[PDB]
Design a protein around this ligand. Structure first.
Ligand SMILES: Nc1ncnc2c1ncn2[C@@H]1O[C@H](COP(=O)(O)OP(=O)(O)OP(=O)(O)O)[C@@H](O)[C@H]1O
Ligand SMILES: Nc1ncnc2c1ncn2[C@@H]1O[C@H](COP(=O)(O)OP(=O)(O)OP(=O)(O)O)[C@@H](O)[C@H]1O
Ligand SMILES: [Mg+2]
Ligand SMILES: [Mg+2]
Lengths: 101, 483, 434
């Protein structure tokens, strides 16, 4: 009554190509391009950036406008460091975290 | 307590540790072991039984196939020598080693078992004293020391661990007097399998035969006559001895007599065959069964040329009978639930499928990409003669063969499939389509050898099969032999 | 629409082969093989003869499929006549095969109506006691039997073929392997006890075998849906037209893969992503989803990974490739590639690209190593077995103790391939030449 079904995730192509005659169904996940990377970064990070404590203390020390501020920051980070990071979501997330305050 | 690792599947036998030398206080305290209810041999079969709800149709060739199964017309001198040595050593209460060697299937185990059966019959007539027969097969042991566990368990009925069993057997063979003993005949079959690095087991088994109180017959069956000279020391070779009995592979006349002895009552005999079902009864149609003497002769000559192995001759005859019975059952449509002859054609077809090679016809039925791989590999062996070619060189030479024969009709239809899979939205590829697939397919087939390397370009690839049969398979193809 | 849902579900059942046993699809080119297998099973389970036979064929060439079909056919009519012992050469070792046989023997014998108790010596002794109104046939299916025909000592094969030969218990052994010369693997006594019954599994020989197999896979022979006749008409119109897209994809598979599971793995999401019957008919007429599938299966290879690179990554890869081409052994490091890179940036800027510093190119270099563009020089990589991998895990390699800018690397893609697949409009194209 119980039938186990295995779902594997693999990283490298050569490890997968070792087992090609087994004819296992495979779904490939190609790397994102820079526009998809920028859209993913905006939709994943602008909410956390626009309710950050540094921005909320800065606006009383000196919502859609804050959204445009965070999105313009993300786009500037992408255009400054896309050659350095490649299409790497994690590295660009780390750069955004280092440079936002 | 907190463990650093766990051993949760330990299965330990109920085997005691105290050897036989501490079983009684003195040597004089040892009783007569023959008058003991556990010494010298003084439940699973019904689980593979069921009730039969049908009636099996045994056709006329089924008795031939049953009589040709492995379950002494050509071994008289070997039988007489083994029997005379064993009879002389049993009746005079001495210990000896008999050495028997030969190729597979030449009747070694059968002759030794027949000798032991005749000696048991003679001991049942009070012409020789009683003995216990023990059969130790070295390929049926999990561990090589388990022979120590087996033999002692056959002698005393106890279950000890192997070292205590070895001390028990040593004390028994050396110290127990002959008036309190029974003779033991031990068959050490597959003697090469009990050879270990330290060779202590071989020394102990052949050194117990040199003890005066042992009353031990060790019949050692081997595969080569030079096993003590090649693998054993001088001490064990001295104890085994100079006299060694060679079992030669059978000549074709003795194989002919073996096959006729299995078919003495079936050949040239009549059966009542029921045409409704196919079930045949040995003495409704009266059908005579016949297997040709020319067929048996040519199978026996072939087998005696190859090995002189009686298993092979019986199997070749059984395969011929199976082929003829398959054709007969196909032409009559019988199922399983005037003269029937198994002919020299069936014997030749049985002899040919064992001699046919599938490698060439496997390679001629591959896809174009695998054949292109093999063809480029052979081209690289022709260009530089290295016999090991890097995979990147094979990639470059496949690309070269595509762009050089570009005006060919088949190549100019194949190029889009090979490099884009027939699609405009797919970029031009550095490997052909199914490159990994045919590489791994040729590796699993055993046609190819590949070194364990992580750089895909400089990884070398070698033919494991012969080069000329690969060339024959390549010239079989229409496209490859034209370019 | 529930009718299209029933048709789609039945099509997926036929593609996965999970039909009931009497509706099971056997391809025509597989027929004469399977009847041969049908003989041997029926001579062992019914007529109680002992058989040993090795099936030889490639992976996904229907050895397990035909064996399972034969056992399912015999289980429907003769279920008290036989038991089944399954061994796999990857999963079972020489020790664990004995425990596997004994455990399967007791769970099959209690299913018909202990052996596996104790140490491995006692377990093997009890197996030899059991195995060495009618008898129950024991059927062994031994997948990857080449792993037990080792050069060291073939104990289990010896004992199993002796059970075929000399035992009074009817035993049927089916071995399965991809090795074409399996008979040379066997030891002399093991080969003498073996019957030399080797069945080579059939191969696809021509295109209409594959077209007939696709027709058997996709025709619905039972009245499960209102759409069955129209789907059968559409499928027969596609397969009868030699200029259709389906026949073109079948022909491409015939000349490249020659594998029906490979085609099935593409056909299954074509059927499954269809939302209604008209969408399914359009999808099977156009076969455009097969092109999308083929593009996705090639998306992470060397060609597709190159197109994901940034301009700095491409510049570092090009510089490393031309340094490796200039090298005698193809070796390079971070320093030589950076020197070639700054020579190309000042040669381009003399005719404005930001020149990235050496401390920032380290991240690009690590990304290029991780994306399998460079390999460490003379690196073995993934070991074949766990013993060699364990031996390698206890040794510190010389590449991991020197600074990263002196580690020797080799290219997975050469400069000529880079010139082949980098577009002419790319502004680093001229440096793929030498
Ligand atoms: N002289 C013979 N007469 C009849 N049958 C024979 C004879 N010799 C061999 N056979 C048949 O061949 C089988 C193989 O013989 P046997 O087991 O003695 O061979 P072996 O020399 O011990 O081989 P292996 O080294 O492979 O164990 C026998 O069981 C029997 O069926
Ligand atoms: N019991 C089964 N029921 C349904 N389909 C099956 C069954 N066994 C195998 N198949 C299918 O049959 C096809 C052929 O693969 P199969 O497993 O029969 O190959 P094989 O020759 O045994 O391969 P390998 O050498 O890798 O073991 C595959 O698409 C597989 O999914
Ligand atoms: Mg023998
Ligand atoms: Mg299989």
């Amino acid at each position: 009554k119980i039938n186990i079904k295995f779902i594997y995730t693999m990283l490298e192509t050569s490890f997968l190509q070792r087992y090609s005659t087994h004819c296992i169904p495979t779904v490939m996940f190609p790397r994102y391009n820079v526009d998809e990377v920028s859209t993913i970064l905006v939709m994943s990070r602008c909410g956390e950036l626009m309710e950050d404590s540094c921005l909320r203390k800065r606006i009383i020390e000196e919502d859609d406008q804050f959204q445009n501020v965070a999105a313009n920051f993300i786009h500037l980070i992408v255009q400054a460091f896309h050659s350095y990071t490649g299409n790497d979501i994690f590295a660009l997330n780390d750069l955004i975290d280092f440079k936002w305050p | 307590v907190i463990r650093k690792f766990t051993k949760k599947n330990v299965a330990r036998a109920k085997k005691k540790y105290t050897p036989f030398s501490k079983r009684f206080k003195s040597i004089a305290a040892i009783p007569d072991l023959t008058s003991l209810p556990e010494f010298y041999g003084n439940r699973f079969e019904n689980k593979l039984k069921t009730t039969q709800k049908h009636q099996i149709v045994e056709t006329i060739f089924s008795k031939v196939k049953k009589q040709l199964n492995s379950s002494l017309p050509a071994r008289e001198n070997e039988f007489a020598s083994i029997y005379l040595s064993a009879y002389s050593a049993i009746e005079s209460d001495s210990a000896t080693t008999i050495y028997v060697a030969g190729t597979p299937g030449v009747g070694k185990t059968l002759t030794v078992r027949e000798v032991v059966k005749e000696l048991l019959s003679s001991s049942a007539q009070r012409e020789i004293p009683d003995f216990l027969y023990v059969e130790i097969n070295g390929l049926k042991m999990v561990k090589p020391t388990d022979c120590y566990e087996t033999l002692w368990n056959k002698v005393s009925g106890e279950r000890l661990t192997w070292a205590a069993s070895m001390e028990s057997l040593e004390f028994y063979f050396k110290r127990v007097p002959k008036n309190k003993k029974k003779t033991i005949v031990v068959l050490l079959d597959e003697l090469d399998a009990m050879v270990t690095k330290s060779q202590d087991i071989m020394y102990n088994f052949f050194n117990w035969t040199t003890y005066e109180n042992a009353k031990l017959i060790v019949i050692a069956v081997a595969n080569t006559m030079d096993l003590p000279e090649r693998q054993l020391g001088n001490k064990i070779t001295s104890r085994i001895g100079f006299t060694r009995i060679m079992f030669t592979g059978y000549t074709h006349e003795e194989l002919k007599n073996i096959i006729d002895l299995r078919l003495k009552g079936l050949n040239d005999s009549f059966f009542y065959v029921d045409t409704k079902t196919g079930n045949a009864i040995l003495i409704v149609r009266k059908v005579r069964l016949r297997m040709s003497a020319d067929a048996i002769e040519i199978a026996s000559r072939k087998v005696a040329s190859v090995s002189g192995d009686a298993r092979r001759a019986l199997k070749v005859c059984k395969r011929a009978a199976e082929i003829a019975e398959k054709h007969y059952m196909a032409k009559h449509g019988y199922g399983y639930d005037g003269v029937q002859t198994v002919h020299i054609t069936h014997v030749m077809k049985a002899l040919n499928e064992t001699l046919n090679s599938h490698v060439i016809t496997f390679m001629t039925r591959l896809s174009f990409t695998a054949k292109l791989f093999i063809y480029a590999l052979l081209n690289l062996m022709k260009k530089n003669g290295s016999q090991e070619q890097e995979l990147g060189d094979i990639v470059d030479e496949i690309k070269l063969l595509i762009e050089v024969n570009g005006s060919n009709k088949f190549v100019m239809e194949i190029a889009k499939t090979l490099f884009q899979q027939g699609s405009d939205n797919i970029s031009e590829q550095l490997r052909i389509i199914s490159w990994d697939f045919v590489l791994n397919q040729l590796l699993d087939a055993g046609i190819l050898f590949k070194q364990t390397m992580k750089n895909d370009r400089i990884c070398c690839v070698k033919l494991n099969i012969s080069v000329e049969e690969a060339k024959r398979a390549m010239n079989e193809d229409e496209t490859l032999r034209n370019l | 629409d529930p009718g299209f849902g029933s048709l789609q579900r039945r099509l997926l059942q036929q593609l996965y082969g999970t039909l009931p046993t009497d509706e099971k699809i056997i391809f025509t080119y597989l027929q004469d093989c399977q009847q041969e297998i049908d003989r041997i099973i029926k001579q062992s389970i019914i007529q109680k003869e002992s058989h040993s036979v090795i099936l030889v064929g490639p992976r996904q060439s229907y050895k397990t499929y035909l064996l399972d079909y034969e056992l399912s056919l015999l289980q429907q009519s003769y279920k008290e006549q036989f038991i089944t012992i399954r061994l796999n050469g990857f999963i079972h070792s020489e020790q664990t095969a004995i425990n596997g046989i004994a455990t399967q023997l007791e769970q099959q014998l209690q299913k018909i109506h202990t052996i596996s108790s104790g140490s491995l010596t006692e377990v093997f002794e009890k197996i030899l006691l059991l195995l060495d109104i009618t008898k129950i046939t024991v059927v062994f299916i031994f997948d990857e039997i080449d792993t037990f025909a080792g050069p060291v000592r073939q104990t289990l094969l010896y004992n199993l073929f002796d059970m075929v030969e000399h035992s009074r218990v009817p035993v049927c052994i089916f071995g399965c392997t991809t090795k074409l010369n399996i008979l040379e693997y066997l030891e002399k006594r093991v080969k003498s006890r073996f019957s030399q019954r080797v069945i080579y599994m059939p191969q696809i020989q021509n295109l209409d075998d594959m077209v007939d197999a696709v027709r058997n896979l996709l025709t619905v022979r039972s009245e499960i849906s209102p759409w069955v006749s129209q789907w059968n008409e559409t499928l027969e119109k596609e397969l009868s037209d030699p200029r259709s897209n389906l026949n073109r994809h079948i022909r491409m598979n015939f000349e490249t893969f020659r594998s029906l599971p490979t085609l099935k793995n593409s056909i299954i999401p074509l059927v499954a992503t269809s939302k209604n019957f008209g969408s399914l008919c359009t999808a099977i007429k156009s076969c455009s989803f097969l092109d999308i599938y083929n593009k996705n299966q090639l998306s992470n290879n060397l060609t597709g990974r190159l197109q994901s690179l940034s301009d700095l990554e491409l510049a570092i890869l090009i510089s490393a490739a031309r340094v490796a081409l200039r090298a005698k052994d193809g070796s390079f490091n971070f320093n030589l590639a950076y020197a070639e890179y700054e020579k190309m940036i000042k040669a381009i800027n003399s005719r404005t690209i930001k020149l990235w510093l050496k401390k920032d190119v380290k991240n690009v270099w690590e990304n290029l190593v991780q994306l399998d563009f460079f390999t460490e020089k003379s690196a073995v990589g993934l070991r074949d077995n766990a013993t060699a991998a364990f031996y390698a895990s206890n040794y510190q390699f010389q590449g991991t103790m020197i600074p990263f800018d002196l580690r020797s690397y080799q290219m997975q893609i050469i400069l000529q391939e880079l010139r082949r697949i980098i577009p002419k409009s790319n502004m680093y194209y001229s440096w793929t030449q030498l």
